[PDB]
Structure formats: C-alpha cells, structure tokens
Amino acid sequence: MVNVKVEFLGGLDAIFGKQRVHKIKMDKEDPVTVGDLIDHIVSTMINNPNDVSIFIEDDSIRPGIITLINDTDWELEGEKDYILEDGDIISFTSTLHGG
Structure with a gap:
C-alpha cells in the first residue's frame, strides 16, 4: 500500500467536489504507478461521469493540465x-494554453 497526496x-477541483487536496490510499502492492493512480482517480473520485473528459483524453491526462x-x-x-513512494505529492493544474 502507498499513501499519496493529490x-x-x-x-480542476470543480470536478473533484470543489476540494483541492486529497489523501489517497492505494491498496495495490508495489509497484504502483502514476498510471494506476490515474485509473483509480477516474473510476472512484469523479462523481459525475460526464466530467471524465475534462481530466482524460486517450487513457491519458488531457493536454492543458500540468502534472x-x-x-x-x-x-x-x-x-x-513513475513508481509511487509513500508521501509523494501529485498535482494536476488546469491551464489555458499549457497544452
């Protein structure tokens, strides 16, 4: 298990309950990748399905979002x-033209 902060x-927090910071427990055994984290965020933390396209395009973070x-x-x-370690912080920032 790895504990990380997103x-x-x-x-972007508008599709994640208007909460900027989240403490995520990844139950998956090491190695747990950022790919696994994103999969987890999409299937468990986006409460309106129609909002997934804001975050994802092509099994990947939508250009414009800085990771x-x-x-x-x-x-x-x-x-x-990237392989996650306990305590890592992953930040996603929506931008206008950072594609």
Missing part, C-alpha cells in the same frame, strides 16, 4: 510509468 489546481510529481514536471519522471 492536488487539483487551476479550477507534477513532488513539484517536478512528470515528463521528467516517466509520466504514467
């Missing part, structure tokens, strides 16, 4: 392939 910023792992850009860490 942050939804830039207005950081512990305050570093996820493209520098393997994106979905």
Whole structure:
C-alpha cells in the first residue's frame, strides 16, 4: 500500500467536489504507478461521469493540465510509468494554453 497526496489546481477541483487536496490510499502492492493512480482517480473520485473528459483524453491526462510529481514536471519522471513512494505529492493544474 502507498499513501499519496493529490492536488487539483487551476479550477480542476470543480470536478473533484470543489476540494483541492486529497489523501489517497492505494491498496495495490508495489509497484504502483502514476498510471494506476490515474485509473483509480477516474473510476472512484469523479462523481459525475460526464466530467471524465475534462481530466482524460486517450487513457491519458488531457493536454492543458500540468502534472507534477513532488513539484517536478512528470515528463521528467516517466509520466504514467513513475513508481509511487509513500508521501509523494501529485498535482494536476488546469491551464489555458499549457497544452
């Protein structure tokens, strides 16, 4: 199990109950990837199905949303392939033109 913190910023928290910060328990045994986390967020934390398209496009985070792992850009860490450790913080920030 890995315990991580997710942050939804830039207005994104509107589809996650208007709550910016979330403490997520991943029951999956190591290795647990950011891909697994995203899968979990989509199937368990988006309470209106029609909102999934805001977060996801193509089994992947929708361009315009900036993803950081512990305050570093996820493209520098393997994106979905990054392996989660206890205490990690994953932040997703909606932007206008950051595609």
